[PDB]
């Protein structure tokens, strides 16, 4: 049934697609195809067990699309139709930019992994602002029905003041976002990840929250920080402190890794960039675990990295995540992966004696 669809995509459709197109062309086609909503609605009906209340909002299910698939806000509606409980677009930079030269996305099918070095290719704030404005009341209804929208902000390659880039993003897209993400963890913009250090981070985030707080109350988003899986213990302890001190609304844990775990088999494993997918999974889960402990369970976490199943999702939830995202799993399993994760998650939750997702959040720590 759903298993027959899963198998079709996994064994026939996706490998054929991966044979005809390069990874970037495939990405661009998927965004186009998804934006038209051509694929029929996902059959899976979200149970009440999957509902989460966090970040000032209701999420009808805890499975979202990670930043990077839809950088420019072109496919938001098509992604809700696929069954995602929330959609995050971006990263968006203030001014339009190309990103890095091609080729810049690489598949590692033997590892169920991707490496990318897009470098924040972005239509920029103005284009994305108008795109979101065109569908603003549709989104207001989606959100009220439990399907929120996040906006992930980046910075221009050549920008002098990182904090002003993020501030601009807060000003322009904050009023259109249920939550904002300060992406300080892209491996593909020089200097960016050092925004994660204590002094810079506190200065940056103070400016961001101050700009957010200046928005009219009805258009005031939660602000989250997205961190790398490659942080030192000092880094993490420092982020936890700053986040608690400033009252940051949550964390996204994690971005892609600049590491190359032992055992990667893919021919393209030494390409420069962020690695995503299955080899990232446990490194992300452990980072979630640590950040939840360091913040005493008081700071919501969206868990991301290598989620391709219900077990993967629950592991992150039990480690401390209130919500989860995926992207890379889609490039191997296609759209059916979304219903797969939700069905399996629900089964596992029953099986382990949780009334719903909310009861499982942080359970490993208790």
Ligand X SMILES: Cc1cc2nc3c(=O)[nH]c(=O)nc-3n(C[C@H](O)[C@H](O)[C@H](O)COP(=O)(O)O)c2cc1C
Ligand Y SMILES: O=C(O)c1cc(=O)[nH]c(=O)[nH]1
Ligand Z SMILES: CC/C(O)=C(\C#N)C(=O)Nc1ccc(-c2ccc(F)cc2)c(C(=O)OC)c1
Binding residues for FMN: 67-71, 91, 152, 183, 226, 254, 277, 306, 327-328
The active-site residue, picked from 25, 47, 122, 186, is: 186
d(CA 247, CA 259): 30
Question: What residues numbered 177-216 form the site for ligand Y, per CB under 6 A?
Answer: 183, 186, 188
Interacting residues with ligand Y between 260 and 299 (CB under 6 A): 274
- Sheet strands (E) in 212-345: 222-227, 250-253, 274-277, 301-304, 323-326
Question: Could you tell me how many residues make up the chain?
Answer: 366
For residue 279, the minimal CB distance to ligand X (Å) is: 9
What distance in Å separates the CA atoms of residue 19 and residue 14, rounded to the nearest whole number? 8
SS3 281: helix
Q: Is the peptide bond before 77 cis (omega within 30 degrees of 0)?
A: no
How far is Cα 311 from Cα 317, in angstroms, rounded to an integer?
10
d(CA 92, CA 174): 12
User: Six-digit token pair at 103?
Assistant: 């080729």
Is residue 91 involved in binding ligand X (CB under 6 A)?
yes
Written as six digits, the tokens of 168 are 């601009």
Choice between 117 and 318, CB closer to ligand Y: 117
For residue 38, with 0-12 CB atoms within 10 Å meaning exposed, 13-18 middle and 19 or more buried, which class applies? exposed
Evaluate whether 132 touches 88 at the Cβ level (below 8 Å): no
- Work out what residue 90 binds among ligand Z, ligand Y, ligand X, none; the CB cut-off runs from 5 to 8 Å by kind: ligand X
For ligand X, the nearest residue by Cβ is 68
Q: Are 319 and 356 spatial neighbours (Cβ–Cβ below 8 Å)?
A: no
233 is catalytic: no
Sequence ranges of the binding site: 67-71, 91, 116-120, 152, 183-188, 226, 254-256, 277, 306, 327-328
Contact status: 139 vs ligand X (CB under 6 A): no
Minimum separation from the CB atom of position 226 to ligand Y (A): 7
Residues flagged as binding site for substrate: 71, 116-120, 183-188, 255-256
Task: Name which of ligand X, ligand Z, ligand Y, none residue 139 binds, using a CB cut-off of 5 to 8 Å depending on partner kind.
Answer: none
304 binds, among ligand Y, ligand X, ligand Z, none (CB under 5 to 8 A by kind): ligand X
CA–CA gap between residue 127 and residue 229 (Å, rounded): 31
**CB contact at 8 A, 90 and 67:** yes
Instruction: Write each residue from 41 to 80 as x if it is in contact with ligand Y (CB under 6 A), else as -, in one continuous string.
Output: ---------------------------x------------
Return the range that interacts with ligand X (CB under 6 A); candidates 5-13, 62-70, 156-164, 217-225: 62-70
| Chain residues in the site for ligand Y (CB under 6 A) | 68, 91, 116-120, 183, 186, 188, 255-256, 274
> Which residues are known catalytic residues?
186
| Chain residues in the site for ligand X (CB under 6 A) | 66-68, 71, 90-91, 105, 114, 116, 118, 152, 183, 226, 255-256, 276-277, 280, 304-307, 326-329
């Amino acid at each position: 049934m759903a298993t027959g669809d899963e198998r079709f995509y996994a064994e026939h459709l996706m490998p054929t697609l991966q044979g005809l197109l390069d990874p970037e062309s495939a990405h661009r086609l998927a965004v186009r195809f998804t934006s038209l909503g051509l694929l029929p609605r996902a059959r899976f009906q979200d149970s009440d067990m999957l509902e989460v209340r966090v970040l000032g909002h209701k999420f009808r299910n805890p499975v979202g699309i990670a930043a990077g698939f839809d950088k420019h806000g072109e496919a938001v509606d098509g992604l809700y139709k696929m069954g995602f409980g929330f959609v995050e677009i971006g990263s968006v930079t203030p001014k339009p930019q190309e990103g890095n030269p091609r080729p810049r996305v690489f598949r590692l099918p033997e590892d169920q992994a991707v490496i990318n070095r897009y470098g924040f290719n972005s239509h920029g704030l103005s284009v994305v602002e108008h795109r979101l404005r065109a569908r603003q009341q549709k989104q207001a209804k989606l959100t009220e029905d439990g399907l929120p929208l996040g906006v992930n902000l980046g910075k221009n390659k050549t920008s002098v003041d990182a904090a002003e880039d993020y501030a601009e993003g807060v000003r322009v897209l904050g009023p259109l976002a249920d939550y904002l993400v300060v992406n300080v963890s892209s491996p593909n913009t020089a200097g960016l990840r050092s925004l994660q250090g204590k002094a810079e981070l506190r200065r940056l985030l103070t400016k961001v929250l101050q700009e957010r707080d200046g928005l009219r109350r009805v258009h005031r988003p939660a602000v989250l920080v997205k961190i790398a899986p490659d942080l030192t213990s000092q880094d993490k302890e420092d982020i936890a402190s700053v986040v608690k001190e400033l009252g940051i609304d949550g964390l996204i844990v994690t971005n892609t890794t600049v590491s190359r775990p032992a055992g990667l088999q893919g021919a393209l494993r030494s390409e420069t960039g962020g690695l995503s997918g299955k080899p990232l999974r446990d490194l992300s889960t452990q980072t979630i675990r640590e950040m939840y402990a360091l913040t005493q369970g008081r700071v919501p976490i969206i868990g991301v990295g290598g989620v391709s199943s219900g077990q993967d999702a629950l592991e992150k939830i039990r480690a401390g995540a209130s919500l989860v995202q995926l992207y890379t799993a889609l490039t191997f399993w296609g759209p059916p992966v979304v219903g797969k994760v939700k069905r399996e998650l629900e089964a596992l939750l029953k099986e382990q004696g949780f009334g719903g997702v909310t009861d499982a959040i942080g359970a490993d720590h208790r």
